[PDB]
Amino acid sequence: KPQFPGASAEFIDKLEFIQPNVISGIPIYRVMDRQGQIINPSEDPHLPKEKVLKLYKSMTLLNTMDRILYESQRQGRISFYMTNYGEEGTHVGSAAALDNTDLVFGAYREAGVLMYRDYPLELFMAQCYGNISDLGKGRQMPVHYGCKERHFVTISSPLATQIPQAVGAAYAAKRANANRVVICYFGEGAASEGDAHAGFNFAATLECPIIFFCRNNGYAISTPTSEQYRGDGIAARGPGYGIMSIRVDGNDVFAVYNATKEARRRAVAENQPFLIEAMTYRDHPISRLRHYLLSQGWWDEEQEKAWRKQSRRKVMEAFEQAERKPKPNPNLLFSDVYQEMPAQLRKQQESLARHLQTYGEHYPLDHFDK
Amino acid sequence: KPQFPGASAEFIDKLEFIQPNVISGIPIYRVMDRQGQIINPSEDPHLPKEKVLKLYKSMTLLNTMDRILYESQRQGRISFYMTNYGEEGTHVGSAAALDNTDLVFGAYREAGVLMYRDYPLELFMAQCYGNISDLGKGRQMPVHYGCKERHFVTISSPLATQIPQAVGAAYAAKRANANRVVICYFGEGAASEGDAHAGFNFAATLECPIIFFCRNNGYAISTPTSEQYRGDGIAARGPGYGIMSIRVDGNDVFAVYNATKEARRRAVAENQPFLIEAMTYRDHPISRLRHYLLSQGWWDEEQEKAWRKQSRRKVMEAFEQAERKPKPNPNLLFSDVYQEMPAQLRKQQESLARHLQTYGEHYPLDHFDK
Amino acid sequence: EYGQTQKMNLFQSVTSALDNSLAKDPTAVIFGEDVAFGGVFRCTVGLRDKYGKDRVFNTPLCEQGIVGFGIGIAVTGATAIAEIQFADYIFPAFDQIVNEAAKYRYRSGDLFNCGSLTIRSPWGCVGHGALYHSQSPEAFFAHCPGIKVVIPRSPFQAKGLLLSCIEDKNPCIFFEPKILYRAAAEEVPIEPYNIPLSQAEVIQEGSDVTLVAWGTQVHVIREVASMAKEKLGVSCEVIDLRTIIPWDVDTICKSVIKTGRLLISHEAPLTGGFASEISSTVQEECFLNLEAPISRVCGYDTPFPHIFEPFYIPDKWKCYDALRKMINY
Amino acid sequence: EYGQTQKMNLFQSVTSALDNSLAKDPTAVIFGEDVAFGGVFRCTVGLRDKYGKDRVFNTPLCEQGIVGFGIGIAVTGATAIAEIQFADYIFPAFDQIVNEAAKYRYRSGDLFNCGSLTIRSPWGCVGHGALYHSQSPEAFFAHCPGIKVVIPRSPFQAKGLLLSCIEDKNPCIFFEPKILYRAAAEEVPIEPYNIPLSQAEVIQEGSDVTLVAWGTQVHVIREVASMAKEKLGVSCEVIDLRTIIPWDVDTICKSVIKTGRLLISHEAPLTGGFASEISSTVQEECFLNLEAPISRVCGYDTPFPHIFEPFYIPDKWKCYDALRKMINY
Ligand SMILES: Cc1ncc(C[n+]2csc(CCOP(=O)(O)OP(=O)(O)O)c2C)c(N)n1
Ligand SMILES: Cc1ncc(C[n+]2csc(CCOP(=O)(O)OP(=O)(O)O)c2C)c(N)n1
Ligand SMILES: [Cl-]
Ligand SMILES: [Cl-]
Ligand SMILES: [Cl-]
Ligand SMILES: [Cl-]
Ligand SMILES: [K+]
Ligand SMILES: [K+]
Ligand SMILES: [K+]
Ligand SMILES: [K+]
Ligand SMILES: [Mn+2]
Ligand SMILES: [Mn+2]
């Protein structure tokens, strides 16, 4: 009987506020328990051994690299680092459910997606060291990775800005008849930004094939979620935008994989956004997968030892190489500001060159390319 | 059994996306039907005759003023105007449920709140004409009203900016032990802005005594709500922030009054935000109230005629006075940029004064105060 | 010179540029608030009917979203023509423009870019716009390496400059002087043509003083030149800057080396206004040639007032008086 | 002069100012991201324990919300001290600062104001901050009448200027040079004291050339003065601007009338940088006194790079070389 264009609803003749359900919120989807046991056989994706080993070796290789680069940071060998501890399963599980060419937007916890996509150790290092091998030309802070070949849009420090950008890229994909989906990762803290509200709403009204992947680890720096929001986490916000939503156990690589695979299938077929909120801690994803492997007869202590050794060696080889490379020519601080260098910018580049001719002794020119 | 700090929830062992309920959304609270009949006696607020007459005369006086100023705008007598047609009941109904000292933040559809609070016709006019009587000193566009005495924060053109400001004023009220609530009005279009997400979330996490009043009339300029959002209007967003939410029939002054009165009571007692979404059209609030009055024996055609005449006369008297007043001294374009005028700004004021001495013939100085 | 022309006012010349763009570039889309029915200033009339609802479409009311969304389209290589309804409302998108769009190519080492983004927005005073429908924000953007900022003075100039922005491989902000939307028409080529970015135009040669402005203020300085000639026997060289950044330093400096005097004018407030950048650069480059201090005739350092507009703007009398004093220095 | 002092570095002097403020003003509150545990740069350590969780508290991660929320507190007359975690992240709040905070008093005819708001934010380069933990945004804000922008060069200056901002009846942005947070300590009065806003400080008198800077760059120009004296026998007058807007035109012009030369330096990019406003004003006021072009030694017109920082910044050698050329002009 109501005739209002803004909503589709009946009348009610009694005053009743709608109360949020926060104490029993959206349940957490699980596939395997903490002992690595499948809980509900009809939900088992039955991934083949080679793929599951790849999930495990991607996670552990990331963890090996984290350990080494975190120590490097403590020594001031690199200026900054962010680890992926506890994140390994959400990133490797979701990346495995994507197409190789699906476009990824993220933040600084998304290195595992690149690791799954076989991004070379040399290039993770090159970016952290800002050396001559970095395709980013040493311009950004460490852990600000990007790869055009692997469809992983360069990370930027301002939180949440990639969310409405991801939606625009998904709109363009739709038009292109890509049969491609975009995934956009962000933390529960970042979800408080205005740009998150922008991206979620545009994705729904413009009917975009995008997966929003929120990593809820309970903290944004020092801030616990009790100071971040008062609704039922981020998953409960999806339906208010008209977005199909799910919450998953981020320590469960199979639950992440299943939810991402189904979100991808439906997003691309229906041109509608999906929201997955993966719960983690900031009972580890690597441990839980190891227990699973150990049940199938797909791993054992000898293989674990050999892989631990091999992965440490590969990371060490990349590390040593990265430290010994020169930094890029200081000229590169002027290019790519615009596609073409404006005459006035070239003038500034020439002025630096002249300056270094005269005062170069006072600059650490030793390890910059010439 | 889940141990995640970010949410309180059970596990689920089967993959199930949460679907939004948009076809049968949050129902629309109603107290009287289109014939002005009370539907459910236990919901009747039984407002006394004097108050109900005041609701009716406030609405119709606003409508009378709208008609005249809209015509004035068509003639270019004033540069701009926004009518309140269809808004009269949401504003007068909600204003009646507030305390006189409750602080109001709004947009350009909130003149009825001022009318209810007995804002003089001379001052509505003064602002639209930018004349010497305007306490805003002619600086803003027409319909950008403000009144410190009546606790109605000056309107600004950028949509939604007042939403997080309203929350800050409510936080300060809480600290002051005010026993005061803040109300913040905005349209369904404005609710798409990032600042709306900011205000709703801060109000919940910081536990502020604020009523968010969203006016959903189905359009934002040319844009229908199908292009504005895809969830169940704005009311369905409240619970995702942890905000107690209700939807009301904005053509029903009693439903608006009841919902605002109860929201005010609980917001001030509990220090928690409430969201009311009032559905309107852009079956009129004035007609529906007139039918109600006519049932109680509280109005009739003779009184309607006399009031129509009296209200037209009062508006005409204010209109004529407003048109004949001079504009403020052009000096006033320099004050209040800072509390105290910086020396360099005073220099600019002196430079205008010197300029006008020499070239004053070329300026429309006729009707500016000297 | 450019094929068949028709008389067009500035809104029509914008539609023509947008039409030409969507005809020749199948990736191109136009979006923003209220663009679908043709826009609040009519700039998109007929385009959705001609090119389709997937190419000319309304967004939710969210400027930060509009610009972020445009950047994302451009990241895939598709041409994104975003509208911001008034330049006064571009501020919510400031972080997406300054931290994201301007830095996108640099920070990725050119692995990604948003060069195919253009943001168009109505700009400048309109007689009664007051604080939020009058602003000229170009100086805020001038301090951000990696974006271009372009402002035309007429329908012919608007279509040629907008086509250049749309095709330029860098994110561009194109400010359309809204007081000119329905002002006088002039002949505008029906087919596409380009006017170069970062190139000022000397519209009238002169020998005693150089006058620089952009947008509507070009017409004000043209009139000032006429007043100076008639009343003072002073020969003014009148220059339309056209691109705010990167700006045409060479054309302005060549003119000032010839005349020895410079007056720059803009509606935006004086302090931190773009005239300060032109003045300081010209002073560095033309120091020995300067016969008098470079004068800046700008809006006052206040918000833009409603009833006081006639007294606020740097009109022909304020510019003329400044000029007279400079000639007498 | 100011009672008992203690050695304090710049973060400690900020805590001291905030402590003094909350002790003497029962309305005052401090809020932002991660302020409760003492802040990412330690500036709020101990304050929540001392003054209570309702007075020193964390917000959600939303800069536009932080500033809008602060404006609302200030509208009720309560002192609102907002933190923005890095100045690079102030941009999402640009619309709330520029369209709302700066215009609040003017647009209401002084019926409402947000004078009791202060926004504090870490600022300037830090050796390895790259694009988003290095920026110096003061020129963006300098073009917005109705806000004040203040930047100290030391712990003594920071506490006195911040107390002034907090007490000033206008919305203020206070930029804290983060490379100085844990640099050398100096004596800072334990009790409150004020340093006036819109007042530059001549820290070293000289007769041949005027040098102007603010923040950390003051220390760079102090060193340049020493190099010029030792290597060139040139006497430099060194000035800390301190307030960006409204700025102390009189002190700078008096100095340049005496010396006849001016060099302005800042980390921010050259184009549209605040040095352009100082230069153009000094040129207008001191034209006949200028012996050489006013020189600007600024960051390049690029985003702020990670690995290239040592080559980007306008260091003592770049300033010294510019100075040498100006002395020889
Ligand atoms: C706009 C902006 N504000 C603040 C920061 C500083 N900051 C860097 S990470 C972070 C916390 C992010 O939390 P969340 O999104 O939950 O991700 P998590 O670190 O938990 O993975 C903050 C506040 C930033 N980078 N960008
Ligand atoms: C930030 C900003 N963007 C755009 C506008 C232009 N604008 C003025 S009113 C309006 C539509 C508002 O719609 P809604 O909030 O639904 O209110 P209604 O007019 O329906 O009452 C728009 C887009 C503005 N004033 N501010
Ligand atoms: Cl970061
Ligand atoms: Cl993020
Ligand atoms: Cl408006
Ligand atoms: Cl609004
Ligand atoms: K980002
Ligand atoms: K507003
Ligand atoms: K472009
Ligand atoms: K203040
Ligand atoms: Mn987190
Ligand atoms: Mn509406």
Side-chain angles (χ1 to χ4, degrees), chain A residues 306-323:
Chain A
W307 170 241
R308 244 191 149 199
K309 166 177 168 174
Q310 173 192 321
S311 60
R312 187 194 145 265
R313 180 182 89 262
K314 287 176 174 301
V315 171
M316 288 306 309
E317 164 190 51
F319 183 84
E320 293 169 13
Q321 170 180 64
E323 283 207 325

Tab-separated table of all heavy atoms in Angstrom, chain A residues 306-323:
chain	number	residue	atom	x	y	z
A	306	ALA	N	63.291	-30.309	4.423
A	306	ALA	CA	63.934	-29.981	3.161
A	306	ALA	C	63.386	-28.667	2.578
A	306	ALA	O	64.140	-27.839	2.068
A	306	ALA	CB	63.776	-31.107	2.169
A	307	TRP	N	62.076	-28.465	2.669
A	307	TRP	CA	61.459	-27.248	2.118
A	307	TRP	C	61.855	-25.996	2.907
A	307	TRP	O	62.107	-24.930	2.315
A	307	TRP	CB	59.944	-27.390	2.090
A	307	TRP	CG	59.249	-26.115	1.769
A	307	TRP	CD1	58.349	-25.443	2.563
A	307	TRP	CD2	59.379	-25.356	0.586
A	307	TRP	NE1	57.907	-24.313	1.927
A	307	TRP	CE2	58.527	-24.224	0.712
A	307	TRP	CE3	60.122	-25.505	-0.597
A	307	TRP	CZ2	58.421	-23.265	-0.271
A	307	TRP	CZ3	59.996	-24.557	-1.589
A	307	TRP	CH2	59.135	-23.442	-1.424
A	308	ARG	N	61.877	-26.118	4.241
A	308	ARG	CA	62.363	-25.056	5.135
A	308	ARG	C	63.779	-24.571	4.742
A	308	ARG	O	64.045	-23.347	4.677
A	308	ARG	CB	62.459	-25.628	6.525
A	308	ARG	CG	61.562	-25.018	7.526
A	308	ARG	CD	61.940	-25.488	8.940
A	308	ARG	NE	61.673	-24.483	9.974
A	308	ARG	CZ	62.225	-24.476	11.193
A	308	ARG	NH1	63.106	-25.420	11.554
A	308	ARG	NH2	61.899	-23.512	12.057
A	309	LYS	N	64.663	-25.541	4.508
A	309	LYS	CA	66.043	-25.301	4.051
A	309	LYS	C	66.079	-24.669	2.655
A	309	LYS	O	66.768	-23.647	2.444
A	309	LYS	CB	66.856	-26.612	4.099
A	309	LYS	CG	68.183	-26.625	3.373
A	309	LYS	CD	68.870	-27.993	3.599
A	309	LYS	CE	70.075	-28.220	2.683
A	309	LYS	NZ	70.788	-29.504	3.040
A	310	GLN	N	65.354	-25.267	1.705
A	310	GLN	CA	65.332	-24.770	0.323
A	310	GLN	C	64.771	-23.332	0.232
A	310	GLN	O	65.289	-22.497	-0.524
A	310	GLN	CB	64.527	-25.705	-0.568
A	310	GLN	CG	64.285	-25.199	-1.986
A	310	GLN	CD	63.233	-26.036	-2.711
A	310	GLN	OE1	63.192	-27.266	-2.561
A	310	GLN	NE2	62.371	-25.379	-3.474
A	311	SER	N	63.716	-23.064	1.003
A	311	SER	CA	63.050	-21.759	0.964
A	311	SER	C	63.964	-20.693	1.634
A	311	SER	O	64.111	-19.569	1.129
A	311	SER	CB	61.615	-21.859	1.554
A	311	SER	OG	61.659	-22.299	2.890
A	312	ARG	N	64.622	-21.057	2.737
A	312	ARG	CA	65.585	-20.141	3.358
A	312	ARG	C	66.721	-19.812	2.368
A	312	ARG	O	67.097	-18.643	2.226
A	312	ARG	CB	66.156	-20.702	4.686
A	312	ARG	CG	67.045	-19.661	5.428
A	312	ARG	CD	67.950	-20.176	6.578
A	312	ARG	NE	69.183	-19.392	6.561
A	312	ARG	CZ	70.310	-19.758	5.950
A	312	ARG	NH1	70.385	-20.952	5.351
A	312	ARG	NH2	71.376	-18.951	5.952
A	313	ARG	N	67.261	-20.834	1.692
A	313	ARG	CA	68.296	-20.622	0.665
A	313	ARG	C	67.857	-19.682	-0.481
A	313	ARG	O	68.599	-18.785	-0.864
A	313	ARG	CB	68.790	-21.944	0.060
A	313	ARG	CG	69.875	-21.723	-1.020
A	313	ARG	CD	70.419	-22.989	-1.741
A	313	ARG	NE	69.613	-23.297	-2.925
A	313	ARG	CZ	68.641	-24.207	-2.962
A	313	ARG	NH1	68.361	-24.945	-1.888
A	313	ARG	NH2	67.954	-24.398	-4.088
A	314	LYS	N	66.684	-19.933	-1.055
A	314	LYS	CA	66.163	-19.099	-2.131
A	314	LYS	C	66.000	-17.656	-1.637
A	314	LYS	O	66.328	-16.705	-2.380
A	314	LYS	CB	64.816	-19.619	-2.642
A	314	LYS	CG	64.895	-20.895	-3.487
A	314	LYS	CD	63.431	-21.338	-3.822
A	314	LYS	CE	63.340	-22.531	-4.799
A	314	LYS	NZ	63.998	-22.278	-6.120
A	315	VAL	N	65.486	-17.471	-0.409
A	315	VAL	CA	65.268	-16.106	0.082
A	315	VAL	C	66.600	-15.405	0.352
A	315	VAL	O	66.756	-14.219	0.045
A	315	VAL	CB	64.377	-16.074	1.335
A	315	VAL	CG1	64.339	-14.671	1.949
A	315	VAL	CG2	62.915	-16.545	1.003
A	316	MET	N	67.546	-16.153	0.919
A	316	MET	CA	68.890	-15.639	1.166
A	316	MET	C	69.602	-15.258	-0.107
A	316	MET	O	70.262	-14.214	-0.129
A	316	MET	CB	69.712	-16.591	2.087
A	316	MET	CG	69.176	-16.524	3.563
A	316	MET	SD	69.059	-14.886	4.351
A	316	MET	CE	70.746	-14.325	4.010
A	317	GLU	N	69.459	-16.057	-1.161
A	317	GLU	CA	70.108	-15.786	-2.453
A	317	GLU	C	69.558	-14.445	-3.010
A	317	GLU	O	70.333	-13.601	-3.475
A	317	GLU	CB	69.877	-16.952	-3.416
A	317	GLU	CG	70.145	-16.663	-4.903
A	317	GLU	CD	69.657	-17.783	-5.862
A	317	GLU	OE1	68.475	-18.234	-5.779
A	317	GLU	OE2	70.452	-18.209	-6.737
A	318	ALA	N	68.237	-14.274	-2.971
A	318	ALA	CA	67.611	-13.032	-3.437
A	318	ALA	C	68.035	-11.833	-2.579
A	318	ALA	O	68.285	-10.734	-3.084
A	318	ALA	CB	66.075	-13.166	-3.442
A	319	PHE	N	68.082	-12.048	-1.261
A	319	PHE	CA	68.450	-11.003	-0.310
A	319	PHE	C	69.843	-10.441	-0.576
A	319	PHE	O	70.033	-9.203	-0.689
A	319	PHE	CB	68.428	-11.557	1.123
A	319	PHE	CG	68.720	-10.507	2.184
A	319	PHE	CD1	67.705	-9.688	2.655
A	319	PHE	CD2	70.017	-10.376	2.716
A	319	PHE	CE1	67.958	-8.731	3.646
A	319	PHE	CE2	70.289	-9.407	3.717
A	319	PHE	CZ	69.276	-8.598	4.169
A	320	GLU	N	70.804	-11.351	-0.669
A	320	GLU	CA	72.194	-10.978	-0.947
A	320	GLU	C	72.360	-10.234	-2.263
A	320	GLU	O	73.018	-9.194	-2.275
A	320	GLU	CB	73.098	-12.191	-0.889
A	320	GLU	CG	73.187	-12.723	0.515
A	320	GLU	CD	73.853	-14.077	0.555
A	320	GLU	OE1	74.461	-14.489	-0.481
A	320	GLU	OE2	73.758	-14.716	1.623
A	321	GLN	N	71.744	-10.740	-3.333
A	321	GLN	CA	71.723	-10.066	-4.619
A	321	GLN	C	71.115	-8.661	-4.504
A	321	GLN	O	71.628	-7.690	-5.112
A	321	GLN	CB	70.924	-10.878	-5.641
A	321	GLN	CG	70.653	-10.099	-6.979
A	321	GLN	CD	69.853	-10.870	-8.047
A	321	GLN	OE1	68.665	-11.216	-7.849
A	321	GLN	NE2	70.497	-11.086	-9.210
A	322	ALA	N	70.017	-8.539	-3.741
A	322	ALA	CA	69.318	-7.254	-3.680
A	322	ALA	C	70.156	-6.205	-2.989
A	322	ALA	O	70.138	-5.033	-3.378
A	322	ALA	CB	67.996	-7.383	-2.993
A	323	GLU	N	70.864	-6.623	-1.947
A	323	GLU	CA	71.696	-5.686	-1.189
A	323	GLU	C	72.893	-5.184	-1.961
A	323	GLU	O	73.380	-4.090	-1.695
A	323	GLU	CB	72.226	-6.354	0.066
A	323	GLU	CG	71.138	-6.412	1.094
A	323	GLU	CD	71.665	-6.440	2.506
A	323	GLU	OE1	72.731	-7.059	2.728
A	323	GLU	OE2	70.978	-5.838	3.364
